[PDB]
């Protein structure tokens, strides 16, 4: 879990102590000494003639715990020069002493394809709801902002993950480590890892607003639709900013060493985790109460299986209640678990645009109208 920021820094001092140590005169040899060599990897002092001495692993090296006492064999020639055993390169030495993947390569595909198709199927859905003026309702406006919240969450995933890959993998190959480290301490880390955090938080609070509005409709009470699309937008977009930003302030005043992805203090992640749990705990209660109503209405129309199967299924994407279901309904870290807790969320944006659009009787019928006029 060692960060590339700290190990790169830990290296440059090691070069600085060694070269100054190499600058200072060591004990003289027998008129010939292996010249003090400060390699990029290893810094070592003068060697006496005919000295075959192994050199220990460097202290800046990351896996020091794994090999606390290990050495790399080195030979010092009687001419005060390095050993020329290697033909391809003048310096020769053996340092092996001091010295999964395919799981991600499949997962990332499904993680990024879902967001590629959630983003694709939500711009189409969001255009229809705005294109057809007959679909303008206070209920479609909650979905209109909900689609915008899924779009902004998918976008922030592409922005952050493609950045990380270009910043680290592309630089790694082209040795652009100095420029890479310039991004780590730059404010572009802070403003891209905080935009992702807000876009994620604003997604879980527009699934709450979707749930609270649906519960207000069923158990209805006094409500100015003019003044209850102002406490829905102020909660969908305003409340997530009310704890994401104070999280950003503590993440900058304190513990701002490596980009912002440390989580070193668990009490400072509760600022952005507890309010998210509230938006997932409440939507579960609304999911229970609404289902306790759908079953109530189906125990008066009297198989309750088929009708209530389609409601419970088509309500989880709307309220995002799979978070609690996956937690308890179903060794903990496994392909099956990750493959479920990712695929359903990545394709959640698609399903919301497939259940509450592209099949809606109002929305489909509007297309049939418009095509008939065409």
């Amino acid at each position: 879990t060692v960060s590339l920021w700290e190990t790169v820094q830990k290296w440059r001092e090691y070069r600085r102590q060694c070269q100054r140590s190499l600058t200072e005169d060591p004990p003289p040899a027998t008129d010939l000494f292996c010249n003090r060599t400060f390699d990029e990897y290893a810094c070592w002092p003068d060697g006496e003639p005919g000295s075959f001495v192994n050199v220990s692993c460097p202290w800046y090296l990351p896996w020091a715990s794994s090999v606390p006492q290990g050495h790399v064999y080195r030979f010092c020639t009687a001419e005060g020069l390095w050993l020329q055993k290697d033909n391809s390169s003048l310096p020769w030495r053996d340092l092996s002493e001091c010295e999964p993947e395919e799981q991600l390569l499949f997962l990332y595909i499904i993680y990024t394809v879902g967001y590629a198709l959630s983003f694709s199927a939500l711009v189409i859905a969001s255009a229809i709801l705005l294109g057809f003026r007959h679909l303008h309702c206070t209920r479609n406006y909650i979905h209109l902002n909900l689609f915008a919240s899924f779009i902004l969450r998918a976008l922030s995933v592409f922005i952050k993950d493609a950045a990380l890959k270009w910043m680290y993998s592309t630089a790694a190959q082209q040795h652009q480590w100095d420029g890479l480290l310039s991004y780590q301490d730059s404010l572009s880390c802070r403003l891209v890892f905080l935009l992702m955090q807000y876009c994620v938080a604003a997604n879980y609070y527009w699934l709450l607003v979707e749930g609270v509005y649906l519960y207000t409709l069923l158990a209805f009470s006094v409500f100015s639709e003019q003044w209850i699309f102002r406490l829905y937008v102020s909660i969908g977009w305003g409340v997530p900013l009310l704890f994401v930003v104070p999280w950003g302030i503590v993440k900058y005043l304190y513990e701002d060493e490596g980009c912002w992805t440390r989580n070193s203090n668990m009490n400072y992640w509760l600022i952005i985790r507890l309010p998210i749990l509230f938006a997932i705990g409440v939507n579960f209660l609304i999911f229970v109460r609404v289902i306790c109503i759908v079953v109530s209405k189906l125990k008066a129309n009297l198989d309750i299986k088929c009708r209530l199967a389609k409601s419970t299924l088509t309500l989880i994407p709307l309220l995002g209640t799979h978070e609690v279901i996956f937690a308890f309904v179903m060794g903990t870290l496994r392909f099956i678990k990750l493959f479920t807790e990712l695929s359903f969320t990545s394709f959640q944006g698609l399903m919301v645009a497939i259940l509450y659009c592209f099949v809606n009787n109002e929305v489909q019928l509007e297309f049939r109208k418009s095509w008939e006029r065409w």
Binding site: T1, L4, Y41, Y168, I276, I280, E323
Partner: peptide
């Protein structure tokens, strides 16, 4: 849940391989 863990896990497994190249080049 939101798989911020994947967001870190993608960072982590990458960071080590990021460190891999830096040390491997630093060897050469």
């Amino acid at each position: 849940f939101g798989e911020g863990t994947f967001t870190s896990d993608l960072s982590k497994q990458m960071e080590e391989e990021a460190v891999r190249l830096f040390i491997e080049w630093l060897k050469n």
